[PDB]
């Protein structure tokens, strides 16, 4: 799945054509197309958890937008396809507009249908059997929590309850015809696990930043690789978690164990669950892994290096100001406004020119 950055280019034409406009891409592996696709969406780093809706069901105009979005593809098309199915459109209808093979479309419609049942039955209808079937389709805990009206952590606890965890398969070029000594894996909901984690060494896990986008390029990946190379050389068993296909970080040669997965809380926790690393590094992959720190720590993950709290202190405009204050350092005059008329006054205080940060 390609990664775009149209928001940064307000006045740009955002319809997809023959001239590339994507700034990067994510890759995913699944035992089935549905599983593969869903995993790819949740690793895209756009805030999606799968097929999150774009338009409201009770929007009178909804069909008009959906139609537009389908006929003239934008970056969001994938999501408008599912919205289309939620709105009553048919696979043939969608086909006629998009030209995307029905083989793919039927799979998306089916997922929408399952989402509709989840919404309906609620968390209460999330029985072991059904939950399993949904996981097997690539459904993220977060997506399922949205539909059921719960916290992601609730679905996760529920899986824990049913002992519903993925298994890991390995890439081997030959469809298992030959054995592999390499550890290049992906998760899935199947029977046999081929992870076979070592009990031998001290493990260090490095979290990558998924697809590249403006602000989050190859620079973060370079650091992730260096970490792996250095510690491995140092004698640690290095574990890389990433899903950017363009990078060296996803080259099997770069780490002792590579998990080609979505850099999400769900995905990472499952790996940590069986690897039981000594430490996890979250400061090298850019924003993506950084935004996971606090939840990882919360879940018991052994996060190494500068703490999530220390990170937060800096990243928190208020915690920070306090510290600078404390250190007796210089900072430009600043205020936190709520209302317009508030700003103008405060602005008076602060003095023009001004830096207005959302």
């Amino acid at each position: 799945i390609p990664r775009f950055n149209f928001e940064k280019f307000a006045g740009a034409n955002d319809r997809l054509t023959t001239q590339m406009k994507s700034v990067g891409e994510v890759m995913a592996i699944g035992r089935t197309q549905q599983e593969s696709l869903q995993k790819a969406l949740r690793g895209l780093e756009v805030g999606a958890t799968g097929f999150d809706p774009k338009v409201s069901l009770d929007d009178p105009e909804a069909l008009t937008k959906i139609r537009r979005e389908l006929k003239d593809a934008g970056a969001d098309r994938i999501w408008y396809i599912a919205d289309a199915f939620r709105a009553g459109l048919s696979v043939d209808g969608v086909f006629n507009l998009t030209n995307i093979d029905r083989w793919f479309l039927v799979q998306i419609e089916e997922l929408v249908r399952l989402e509709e049942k989840v919404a309906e039955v609620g968390i209460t209808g999330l029985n072991a059997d059904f939950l399993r079937q949904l996981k097997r389709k690539g459904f993220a805990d977060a997506r399922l929590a949205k539909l059921a009206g719960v916290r992601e952590a609730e679905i996760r606890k529920l899986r824990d309850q049913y002992d519903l965890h993925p298994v890991y398969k390995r890439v081997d070029t030959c469809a298992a015809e030959f054995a592999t000594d390499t550890a290049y894996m992906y998760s899935t909901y199947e029977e046999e696990c081929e992870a076979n984690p070592s009990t031998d060494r001290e493990k260090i896990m490095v979290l990558g930043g998924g697809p590249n986008r403006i602000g989050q390029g190859i620079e973060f990946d370079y650091c992730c690789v260096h970490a792996s190379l250095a510690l491995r050389e140092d004698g640690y068993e290095t574990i890389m978690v990433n899903c950017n296909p363009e990078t060296v970080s996803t080259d099997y040669d770069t780490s002792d164990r590579l998990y080609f997965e979505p850099v999400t809380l769900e995905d990472v926790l499952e790996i940590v669950r069986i690897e039981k690393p000594k430490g996890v590094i979250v400061q090298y992959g850019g924003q993506t892994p950084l935004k996971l720190a606090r939840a990882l720590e919360a879940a018991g993950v052994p996060v190494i290096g500068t703490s999530p709290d220390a990170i937060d202190r800096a990243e928190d405009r208020e915690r920070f100001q306090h510290a600078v204050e404390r250190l007796k350092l210089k900072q430009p005059a600043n205020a936190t406004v709520t209302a317009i008329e508030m700003a103008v006054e405060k602005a008076k205080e602060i003095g023009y020119p001004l830096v207005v940060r959302p």
Binding site: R31, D101, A175
Partner: protein
């Protein structure tokens, strides 16, 4: 909920969904790495008594069509897949997989950990198994059926799939544009080849016809005498199921042919038979070769071909008679893939030159056959 279950001799169970006929199936279980060509695969007579597992997860993406049938029926004893897609999506499709399965009355299961199964087969070797599709499939009973299976080793399946009576084949290969041709006319084909049906694949015949060969398909058990009487430009030995070893009749017949100067070419089972006939031995492999990406070296030329494979037995290279020279070896395991008689106009290939499904890399093997024939006719 339509249940199905697969149980192996070792007792390993695979719980899934029935996608074909209701009932039970028993046979040797095999894995095939072919990401495409499932229909061709199922209709391959070499798969008689075998339960076929496909490694590629989505099986049935392009539905099915007559043109994609390698024989009259589905010979695969059963089919095992990870996922049966919601729809078939290809211009050429005439019937979705499930329907077709049900049509041919095949027991088949979907939704199982085909990877687990593959790894098991590769690691521990081939195993017999049983599939039960029904309301409440009985594991115990499946196990008994799988344990009671006699095993393909030493089993003559050729005599089981062969043709009752002899016939004539004059039809050529399919084309995108035209599709399957119309049967040529006898006076249109320069050569006349006699083909032993050990359970022959349509493509093999079609491709011979493309090369200008008019065919006479005979029943496996046909006498060399009865044959010679036909004044063949050449004799071809088809592919087929089970152990080549127990096919006394054919080995004997071939032996006869080898006394003559008529050109002989065998493919697969026929390769095996030709080797036996020359005094070589065959063995049953660990899990065998089944797929369409198998690298085979032409030792003579030092070139590689990506081939189509489907065999559980092989010719032992170490027991090869001096009058048998090695022409091809597998790059995957080193096993014997081709041989030529040092003293006679006879040679064979373990792979499938006619593919269907598979890479076309090996089709030139046919050409060599033709040379032998033209030269035989010169003389």
């Amino acid at each position: 909920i339509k249940s199905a279950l697969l149980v192996l001799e070792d007792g390993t169970q695979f719980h899934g969904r029935a996608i074909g006929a209701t009932g039970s199936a028993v046979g040797e279980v095999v894995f095939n790495t072919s990401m495409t060509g499932y229909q061709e695969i199922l209709t391959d007579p070499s798969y008689s008594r075998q339960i076929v597992t496909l490694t590629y997860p989505h099986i049935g993406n392009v539905g099915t069509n007559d043109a994609d049938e390698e024989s009259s029926q589905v010979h695969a004893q059963g089919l095992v897949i990870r996922d049966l897609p919601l729809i078939a999506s290809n211009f050429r499709n005439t019937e979705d997989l499930s329907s077709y399965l049900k049509r041919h009355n095949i027991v088949a299961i979907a939704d199982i950990d085909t990877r687990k199964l593959t790894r098991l087969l590769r690691e521990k070797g081939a195993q017999n198994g049983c599939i039960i599709a029904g309301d409440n499939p009985d594991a115990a009973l499946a196990l008994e059926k799988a344990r009671a299976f006699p095993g393909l080793n030493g089993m003559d399946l050729a005599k089981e799939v062969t043709t009752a009576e002899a016939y004539s084949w004059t039809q050529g290969s399919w084309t995108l544009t035209g599709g399957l041709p119309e049967a040529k006319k006898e006076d249109e084909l320069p050569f006349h080849v006699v083909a032993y049906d050990f359970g022959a694949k349509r493509n093999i015949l079609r491709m011979l016809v493309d090369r200008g060969c008019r065919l006479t398909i005979v029943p496996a058990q046909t006498s060399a005498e009865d044959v010679l009487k036909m004044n063949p430009d050449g004799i071809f030995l088809s592919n087929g199921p089970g152990d080549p070893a127990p096919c006394d009749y054919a080995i004997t017949a071939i032996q006869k042919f080898l006394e003559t100067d008529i050109p002989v070419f065998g493919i697969c089972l026929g390769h095996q038979l030709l080797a036996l006939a020359s005094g070589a031995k065959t063995v049953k492999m660990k899990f065998g070769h089944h797929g369409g990406n198998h690298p085979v070296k032409d030792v003579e030329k030092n070139v590689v071909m990506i081939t189509a494979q489907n065999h559980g037995f092989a010719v032992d290279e170490a027991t090869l008679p001096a009058n048998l020279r090695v022409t091809h070896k597998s790059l995957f395991d080193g096993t014997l893939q081709g041989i030529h008689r040092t003293d006679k106009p006879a040679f064979s290939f373990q792979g499938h030159p006619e593919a269907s499904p598979g890479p076309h890399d090996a089709a030139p093997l046919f050409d060599h056959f033709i040379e032998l024939i033209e030269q035989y006719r010169k003389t």
